[PDB]
């Protein structure tokens, strides 16, 4: 088999050698413009149209969890990916654990009021604060997917009440499952902490807006780990200023790098990380890709597959 | 049986009623000066000498995990507690989990470089930082006791390399156990994060000093959850300023409330909480005390007992 690889910023030489070692029967090469030699599999991130267009590939692997950019690209250039080509994405490959690290750290951070103590430390002010209680600290997770379930599981360890929201019902014992736009209000009403792990689709763009934020309990916390387009930044700023939202930690934004004029940077109740919540671990991705190719060759079921009509 | 209760700041009425409900055969009363009526058990925090002196109690329960103040008090007033009186302390009663919340949150906080991103956010500066790796993030725990083991266990969940230090060898699979002054250097040499859960004894006062801090790897983190007397604050400040210690989160200090003149308050790399790491949960303490009295009455073994010669 022949594998073509393309990523704009990763260590291409490392990946290619690791793929050769993991799939010894594969000829693995870096794709450059002009290469129209055959390929059975394409491993891509932000690929050019010319790399995929008119290729009857056996599969394409998107080297990330989110596929919103490939899809919108294929939207603008429908000839980029023939409809017979299955599209795969990275399911977990270390991003589950990284999302758990981020979510558990910050949730405990808010629950133990380290944000308040930091404000007080700024004034050299010593004052113990009343403790919060698990019953008042229900955590709602917006997507209930590969990453959503991982986060939920890690938070169950800490005995927080848990609820998730998705398109289809989930069966997680101890997590109250909400499904559909019609149940979104009920879900929101108890979320002391709202964690966003939705994919970017037309049905979810802008979903965290004034209408959503007003359904939250007062003094809620927003942890946006998914895509910046999910949040209407002005509505968030208004909810922060009214006390509706006590605090927000944001890893993604409508424009990235977040422009320095944005009020989010210097807002006392906002924490910013430069889109680093979860990046794939190359050794785990190489294991996942070679295992998936192997299952494809054996006729076994794989499932980590992107539904291009559904949008994720 | 007769129980006398004394605490300077807790809700005495709540405790007394909860103890009555949990031990229905007990007459439970709040101790006030002048009360020399009989008592089988004393539940005390920071008691006056007059409450205990010359009483042939069946047991005394210190309403906390640390007993350094009762002991030093009994040191200054040897008649306060007859040597036949067994002294008990609160083992866990919810402080294990609270120490796990604090330790896991901050360790992940440092490991994911949220401290660096916060510095950068202060300048509205957007920059992803190289990730840290578990192999370089060994966590050492200074005490290996009730709270030390709880913290170690919660950190094992996250796959950090773990090592503990104590007087006696421990048998925790996956945690490398160090014991005695003679092995303290070897223990320190790999501690990327040093978590202090020692009791305050004459053998441990001042142990975190220039000599200890220089044995640490560079860019270490100090998390002091035990007693302020363990840390020589000037030596810590010097290690912070030289880059030896990247960061310190401190819940306890040599004087409390930490005086506002202390450089710790405004130091960029120091986080301060007003001695709130772990407080006992009254319902869990009442359960532990009544269960312990019950075991004492049945002749079973209890063990949560303070060794007054040893100092903890
Ligand atoms: N560094 C970073 O910040 C970072 C890293 C990785 C990923 N991410 C983001 O995290 C997202 C989640 O990844 P994942 O692997 O967990 O995705 P996933 O397994 O595909 O899960 C997505 C979840 O969103 C739900 N969903 C989709 N559309 C919906 C709608 N209209 N209404 C309600 N629920 C809807 C799905 O419901 P069903 O279960 O019913 O299908 C699913 O539970 C990615 O899409 C990516 O944008 C961010
Ligand atoms: N809010 C707060 O900040 C807060 C709350 C609760 C407790 N604390 C502090 O946390 C401490 C720990 O409580 P705990 O219940 O975990 O106590 P513990 O079960 O008695 O454990 C103490 C540990 O320290 C070790 N140790 C004592 N002296 C030593 C020495 N000279 N050299 C080496 N190791 C020594 C002991 O070793 P062995 O196992 O060999 O005996 C033991 O493992 C308390 O004493 C208290 O000061 C703070
Ligand atoms: Na390339
Ligand atoms: Na993409
Ligand atoms: Na609680
Ligand atoms: Na009292
Ligand atoms: Na004490
Ligand atoms: Na790692």
- Residues enclosing ligand 1, CB less than 6 A? A 65-66, 95, 143-148, 165-168, 197-201, 203-204, 225-227, 251-252, 275, 277-278, 312
Do A196 and A143 contact (CB within 8 A), yes or no? yes
Distance, in angstroms, between B294 CA and closest chain A CA? 29
Do A271 and A249 contact (CB within 8 A), yes or no? yes
Q: Which of B269, B275, B281, B308 is catalytic?
A: B275
**A105 and B101: CB-CB below 8 Å?**
no
User: Ligand 2 within 6 A of B194 CB?
Assistant: no
Q: Compute CA distances B33 → B13, B37, B46, B50, B55, whole Å.
A: 17, 11, 14, 7, 14
Atom 31, ligand 1: residue with shortest CA distance: A203
Distance, in angstroms, between A260 CA and closest chain B CA? 6
Q: Which residues of B touch A137 (CB under 8 A)?
A: none
- Please count the other Cβ atoms lying within 10 Å of the Cβ belonging to residue A279: 16
Residue B87, SS3 per DSSP? strand
Q: Which of B112, B120, B124 sits opposite A105 (nearest CB)?
A: B112
Q: Which of A112, A260, A272 sits opposite B101 (nearest CB)?
A: A112
Enter the tokens of residue B98.
């609270």
> Could you give the CA distance from residue A153 to residue A108 in angstroms, rounded to a whole number?
15
Beta strands in A167-269 (DSSP E): 175-179, 193-196, 220-224, 245-250
A interface residues, B as partner, C-beta within 8 Å:
101-102, 104-105, 108-109, 111-112, 114, 117-118, 120-121, 124, 126-129, 131, 157-158, 256-258, 260, 265-266, 271-276, 279
End-to-end C-alpha distance for chain A, whole angstroms: 28
Nearest-5° Cα angle at A221, A219 to A226: 155
> Could you give the CA distance from residue B290 to residue B301 in angstroms, rounded to a whole number?
14
Atom 34, ligand 1: residue with shortest CA distance: A166
DSSP string, B179-247: ESGGGHHHHHTT-SEEEE-----TTTTT-BSHHHHHHSPTTEEEEE-S-GGGB-HHHHHHHHHHTSEEE
Distance, in angstroms, between A180 CA and closest chain B CA? 33
Q: Which of A227, A230, A308, A310 is catalytic?
A: A227
Looking at domain B1-95+279-312, which of 3.40.50.720, 3.30.460.80, 3.40.50.1000, 3.40.1350.10 is its CATH number?
A: 3.40.50.720
What does this entry list as its resolution, in Å?
2.6
Beta strands in A157-251 (DSSP E): 162-166, 175-179, 193-196, 220-224, 245-250
Looking at domain A96-278, which of 3.30.230.80, 3.90.180.10, 3.30.300.180, 3.40.50.720 is its CATH number?
A: 3.40.50.720
Interface test with A, best of B9, B105, B228, B275 (most A CBs within 10 A): B105
Q: What are the residues whose beta carbons fall under 8 Å from the beta carbon of A173, sequence distance 6 or more?
A: none
Helix axes A95-111, A146-156, angle to 10 degrees: 40
R_g of chain B computed on alpha carbons: 21
End-to-end C-alpha distance for chain B, whole angstroms: 28
Q: Give A139's strand partners.
A: A162, A193
Q: Compute CA distances A256 → A47, A146, A238, B28, B184, whole Å.
A: 19, 25, 21, 64, 47
Q: Where are the domains of chain B?
A: 1-95+279-312, 96-278
Give CA A247 to chain center in angstroms.
20
With the C-alpha atoms ordered B145, B149, B155, B160, is the resulting torsion angle positive or negative?
A: positive
| Dihedral angle, C-alpha A48, A50, A53, A58, nearest 10 ° | -70
Q: Do domains A1-95+279-312 and A96-278 have the same CATH topology?
A: yes
> Could you give the CA distance from residue B87 to residue B64 in angstroms, rounded to a whole number?
12
Do B15 and B5 contact (CB within 8 A), yes or no? yes
């Amino acid at each position: 088999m022949d594998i073509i690889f393309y990523h704009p910023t990763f260590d291409t030489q490392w990946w290619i050698e690791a793929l050769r070692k993991a799939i010894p029967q594969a000829r693995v090469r870096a794709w450059k413009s002009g290469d129209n030699d055959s390929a059975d599999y394409a491993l891509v991130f932000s690929p050019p149209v010319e790399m995929l267009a008119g290729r009857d590939l056996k599969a394409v692997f998107a080297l990330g969890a989110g596929v919103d950019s490939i899809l919108s690209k294929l939207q603008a250039h429908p000839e980029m990916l023939n409809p017979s080509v299955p599209l795969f994405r990275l399911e977990d490959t270390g991003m589950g654990e990284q999302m758990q690290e981020y979510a558990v750290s910050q949730v405990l951070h808010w629950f133990r009021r380290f944000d308040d103590y930091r404000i007080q430390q700024n004034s050299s002010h010593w004052q113990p604060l009343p403790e919060y209680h698990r019953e008042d600290f229900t955590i709602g997770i917006l997507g209930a997917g590969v990453l959503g379930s991982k986060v939920a599981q890690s938070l169950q360890t800490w005995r927080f009440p848990l609820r998730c929201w998705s398109r289809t019902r989930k069966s997680w014992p101890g997590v109250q499952s909400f499904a559909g736009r019609e149940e979104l209000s009920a879900f929101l009403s108890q979320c002391r902490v709202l964690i966003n792990l939705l994919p970017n689709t037309p049905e979810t763009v802008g979903i965290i807006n004034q209408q959503l934020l007003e359904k939250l309990p007062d003094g809620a916390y927003l942890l946006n780990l998914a895509r910046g387009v999910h949040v209407v930044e002005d509505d968030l700023l208004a909810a922060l200023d009214s006390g509706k939202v006590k605090g927000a930690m944001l890893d993604v934004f409508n424009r990235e790098p977040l422009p320095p004029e944005s009020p989010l940077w210097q807002h006392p109740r906002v924490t910013i990380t430069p889109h680093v919540a979860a990046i794939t671990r190359p050794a785990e991705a190489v294991e996942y890709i070679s295992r998936t190719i192997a299952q494809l060759e054996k006729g076994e079921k794989v499932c980590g597959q992107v539904d291009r009509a559904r949008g994720y």
